[PDB]
Amino acid sequence: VISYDNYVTILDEETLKAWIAKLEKAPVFAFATETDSLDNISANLVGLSFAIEPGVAAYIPVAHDYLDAPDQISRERALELLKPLLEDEKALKVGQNLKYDRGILANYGIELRGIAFDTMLESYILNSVAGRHDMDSLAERWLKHKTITFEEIAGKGKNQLTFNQIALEEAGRYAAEDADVTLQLHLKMWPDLQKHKGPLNVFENIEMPLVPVLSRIERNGVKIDPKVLHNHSEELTLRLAELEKKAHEIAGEEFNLSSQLQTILFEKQGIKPLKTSEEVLEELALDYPLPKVILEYRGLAKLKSTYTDKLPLMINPKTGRVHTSYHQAVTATGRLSSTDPNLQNIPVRNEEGRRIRQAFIAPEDYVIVSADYSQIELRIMAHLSRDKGLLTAFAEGKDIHRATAAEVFGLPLETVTSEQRRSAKAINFGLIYGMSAFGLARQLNIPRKEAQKYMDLYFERYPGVLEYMERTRAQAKEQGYVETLDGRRLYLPDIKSSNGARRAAAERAAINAPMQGTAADIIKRAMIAVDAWLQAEQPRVRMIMQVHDELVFEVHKDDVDAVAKQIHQLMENCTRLDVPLLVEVGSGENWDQAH
DNA sequence: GCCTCGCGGCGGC
DNA sequence: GCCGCGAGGC
Ligand SMILES: [Zn+2]
């Protein structure tokens, strides 16, 4: 197993100073933080652990307070001896999700500075789709070492012990083993990473410097107005009733129900539909009423609970603000998923979604400033296909949907019917998602091979797009992956799936990911760029959220004119300067007003 | 306290 | 590409 004889628990200053001297001369050192809660802003540090060499790791208890607990170094002293090591940029620390550890250390006025290697990210940059990137999983994968899962030394459920209650030597067993494994994992992964500059560059210059900016954004969080949501909740209740009523105008009783089960699904028999919702029961049809009205219902109920009713319950008591959680190593293409307030999931073009964005308030004398990337994936696609047509559309500011419509439908720009710009929009966005022709016919759902004819007309006027496409489908099967403009690799194991039906999903994915991924890398770079500028100049502005391509700030009303200008300089410049970039900036007293 | 289906999650303690 | 939480039958 692992226990009390491996790692040392440091309960006295003399030993601690000895360990600091060796940390001062180590090339890189690991390190962990042990707390009494996962809330990075309300958690109290309970102990730390460091490992300098496989097997050589120790635990330092500072705040264990159970019945009759042994005397320990105080948190204050342990930290004042550890602080200069912790803030020394020349001291390269290694850890598993060092964003947490940065936040906790930030709570004591300590700015963690040697954030050199984060194992969870090395895993993610090594292979995005390889599997779960949590340490227990990396331990079985990279080292076949079954670790001590947290649940063992703390218990499960309600009477789960928090770390400070857990006995000094058991705590030590987990925390020091953690520190040690983290280091061994770094020792396996960093070599492989160094192999080939694509991935290594993303790690070195996007992924790792982003970690402390993500701890800043979460700890800033957002200010929300619980009143506005409550009004929209009463209203959402009302609206559900109609659906309930409108839903029932298309049928039925009977009911016991609602809500799912055999009750709504019953009608798949007599309300003659083809035959687990959102999904199946393709109403992709105008009528039948049942798989249409109950979808309008599920959607607003969702909206109601998930946002309108949960957002008021998530205000942090210490800050009076909501702190969304950004997960850096979870999506397959390189994007950031926000959870708890999952900003990505609030509907952009919907009337009930525009109310939610109104709840996000700018504090007194501050306004919300939004900076969004103007359809960057199409500008990225334009850059990946070397198609002079698309390049020029963007060069002289032509609305690409209308210019594309003028070429595809062979007609003068000035007279483009809006009826044609829509058909041009569908195709254009289609190619970004690697839309398999029928995809167009089902998105712009009403034509058949007319879409096929459309694709022909677009590729004849824009050959570069399918040049791009074939080249990508090629390197996809060939190498087993596709890379973004900087080197991020999506590994596609099923591109060669021996006609495994949706092997073609990997083909789609192959054309999709380079665009999604380069956009993602571009935003991360912009984030790093802006944050840097904030840490140096410290203007009255805080970066409060990031979602889908826009970055939301909270700039002081007086300073907005220069700040919106700086964002405009930073973002479309020290980012992917080889793509033609446009960032739209808005200001309003709330997120939607700034949109 | 128990089972199955449907939507939103995956790190850190 | 696999796990969880929450609702409805019960
Ligand atoms: Zn930890």
Helix (H, G, I), strand (E, B) or coil at A79: helix
C-alpha distances (whole Å) from A76 to each of A24, A33, A63, A155, A258 are 20, 15, 10, 29, 56
In order of A32, A154, A187, A395, A421, the CA distances from A146 in angstroms are 19, 17, 17, 56, 57
Same domain, A319 and A409: no
**A590: its two tokens:** 């709330």
Q: Of A579, A386, A378, A578, which Cα lies nearest the Cα of A466?
A: A386
User: A98: closest CA among A25, A36, A16, A186?
Assistant: A186
3-class SS at A232? helix
The answer to whether residues A371 and A427 belong to one domain is no
* Domain finish residue from A489, A519, A549: A519
CB of A100 closer than 8 Å to CB of A219: no
Kindly state whether residues A177 and A96 are assigned to the same domain.
Answer: yes
Sheet with A92-95: strands ordered across: A28-29, A92-95, A115-118
List the CATH number of the domain containing A120: 3.30.420.10
Looking up tokens 């087993």 gives A480
Identify any residues that bridge with A337 across adjacent strands, giving them in sequence order.
A327
Identify the experimental approach: X-ray
Select from A204, A219, A234 the last residue of a domain: A219
Please indicate, yes or no, whether residues A256 and A359 belong to a single structural domain of this protein. Answer: no
Q: Which nucleotide is nearest to A329 (CA to C1')?
A: B11
How far apart are alpha carbons A97 and A134 in whole angstroms?
Answer: 9
Q: Single out the residue of A220, A202, A433 nearest to residue A328, CA to CA.
A: A202
Token pair recorded at residue A190: 């960093």
- Whether any strand C atom is under 7 angstroms from the Cβ of A21: the reply reads no
Determine if strand C comes within 7 Å of the CB of A332: yes
Q: Do A320 and A175 lie in a common domain?
A: no
Question: Which residues have a C–N gap over 2.5 Å right after them in chain A?
Answer: 259, 275
Please name the residue whose C-alpha is nearest to the C1' of nucleotide B5: A276
- Give the residue carrying structure tokens 């939301």: A552
Q: What residue has token string 């249409």?
A: A292
Please state, in angstroms and as integers, the Cα–Cα distance from residue A357 to each residue in A314, A340, A351, A389, A529, following that order.
Answer: 16, 15, 10, 37, 26
- Which candidate, A378, A292, A306, A379, places its Cα nearest to that of A347? A306
Closest-CA residue to A98 (of A78, A118, A83): A118
By DSSP bridging, strand A115-118 and strand A92-95 are parallel
The whole-angstrom separation of Cα A55 and Cα A91 is 20
Q: Ligand 1 centre from A98 Cα, in Å? A: 9
Domain termination site, one of A161, A189, A219: A219
Beta strands per DSSP E along A494-582: 541-547, 550-556
A331 and A290 in one domain? no
Resolution (angstroms) equals 3.2
Angle between helices A13-24 and A75-86 (to 10 degrees): 10
The structure tokens 């300089």 sit at A569
Which residue is listed with tokens 């293409």? A333
CA of A339 to C1' of C5 (A): 15
Helix axes A388-395, A400-408, angle to 10 degrees: 140
Please list the residues that pair with A119 across neighbouring strands.
none
- The span from the CA of A90 to the CA of A427, in Å, is 52
Please report which residue ranges of A433-503 form alpha helices under DSSP H.
438-443, 450-461, 463-479
Place of tokens 């919106």: A564
HEC string of A305-332 equals HHHHHHHHHCCECCCCEECCEEECCCCC
CATH number, domain with residue A350: 3.30.70.370
Rounded to whole angstroms, the Cα distance separating A233 from A206 reads 40
Structural contact between residues A371 and A568, judged by C-beta atoms closer than 8 angstroms? yes
Cβ neighbours around A255 below 10 Å, total: 10
Report residue A148 as tokens: 């001590």
DSSP A252-311: ----S-----HHHHHTTTTS------SSSS---SS--SHHHHHHHHHHHHHHIIIIIIHH
Check whether residue A170 and residue A227 sit in a common domain.
Answer: no
Q: How far is the CA of A100 from the centre of ligand 1 (A)?
A: 8
Q: How far apart are CA A295 and CA A277, in angstroms?
A: 8
CB A1 within 8 A of CB A177: no
Tokens representing A468 are 């791009």
d(CA A34, CA A53): 20
Tokens 């936040």 sit on residue: A103
Number of helices (H) and strands (E) in chain A: give both, helices first: 24, 17
Largest CA distance in chain A: 85
Give the Cα separation of A309 and A305 in Å (integer): 5
Q: Which helix (H) or strand (E) holds A250?
A: none
The rounded distance, in Å, linking the Cα atoms of A105 and A118 is 16
Round to whole Å and give the CA distance between A183 and A177. 10
Neighbouring residues of A367: CB distance < 8 A, sequence distance ≥ 6: A554, A555, A556, A557, A560, A587, A588, A589, A594
For residues A41 and A92, the answer to whether their CB atoms sit within 8 Å is no
Name residue A429's amino acid. F
Which nucleotides of strand C lie within 7 A of protein CB?
1, 7-10
CATH number at residue A239: 1.20.1060.10
The domain in which residue A85 lies consists of 1-219
CB A362 within 8 A of CB A223: yes
Q: Could you tell me if A139 and A45 lie in one domain? A: yes
Q: Which residue's CA is nearest to the C1' of nucleotide B10? A: A330
Cβ pair A515, A529 in contact under 8 A: no
Protein A457 CA to nucleic acid B9 C1', in Å?
42
Q: A416-443 burial, b for 16+ CB within 10 Å, e for fewer?
A: beeebbebbbbbbbbbbbbbeeeebbee
Give exposure, A270-289, as e/b (b: 16+ Cβ within 10 Å). ebebeeeeeeebebeeeebb
> Domain with A484 in it: what CATH number?
1.10.150.20
CB A168 within 8 A of CB A42: no
What is the C-alpha separation between A270 and A249, in angstroms, rounded? Answer: 16
Cα(A50) to ligand 1 centroid in Å equals 12
Distance of CA A355 to the CA centre of its chain: 23
Q: How far is the CA of A332 from the centre of ligand 1 (A)?
A: 23
* CA–C1' A508–B5 (A): 29
Cα separation of A423 and A430, whole Å? 11
A553 three-state secondary structure: strand
- Per the structure block, which two tokens stand in for A383? 């850059």
Question: How far, CA to CA in Å, does A538 sit from each of A95, A411, A461, A561, A575?
Answer: 28, 52, 49, 16, 21
Total Cβ atoms within 10 A of residue A471: 13
A51 and A103: one domain? yes
Measured distance CA(A535)–CA(A114) in Å, rounded: 16
CA of A378 to C1' of B4 (A): 43
Cα A136 from chain centre: 21
Nucleotides of strand B within 7 Å of the protein's CB atoms: 5-13
Residues A316 and A389 in one domain: no
- A62 plus A208 within the same structural domain: yes
| Contact between residue A590 and residue A544 where contact means Cβ atoms under 8 Å apart | no
- Residue A269, C-beta contacts closer than 8 angstroms, at least 6 positions apart: none
Per DSSP, the three-state class of A540 is coil
A365 and A399 co-located in one domain: no
d(CA A412, CA A395): 18
**Do A591 and A552 form a contact (C-beta atoms < 8 A)?**
yes
DSSP secondary structure of A125-173: HH-TTSS--SHHHHIIIII------HHHHH-SSTTPPPGGGS-HHHHHH
First to last CA, chain A: 55
3-state secondary structure of A550: strand
Q: How far is CA A407 from the centre of its chain?
A: 37
User: What would the two tokens of residue A243 be?
Assistant: 């659906």
Spacing, Cα A33 to ligand 1 middle (Å): 6
Judge whether A179 and A50 are in contact, CB under 8 Å.
yes
| Count of domains forming chain A | 4
**Contact by Cβ (8 Å): A482, A490:** yes
DSSP string, A355-407: HHHHHEEPPTTEEEEEEEESSHHHHHHHHHHT-HHHHHHHHTT--HHHHHHHH
* Strand, coil or helix: A474: helix
Interval between CA A205 and ligand 1 midpoint (Å)? 24
| A277 CB contact with strand C at below 7 Å | no
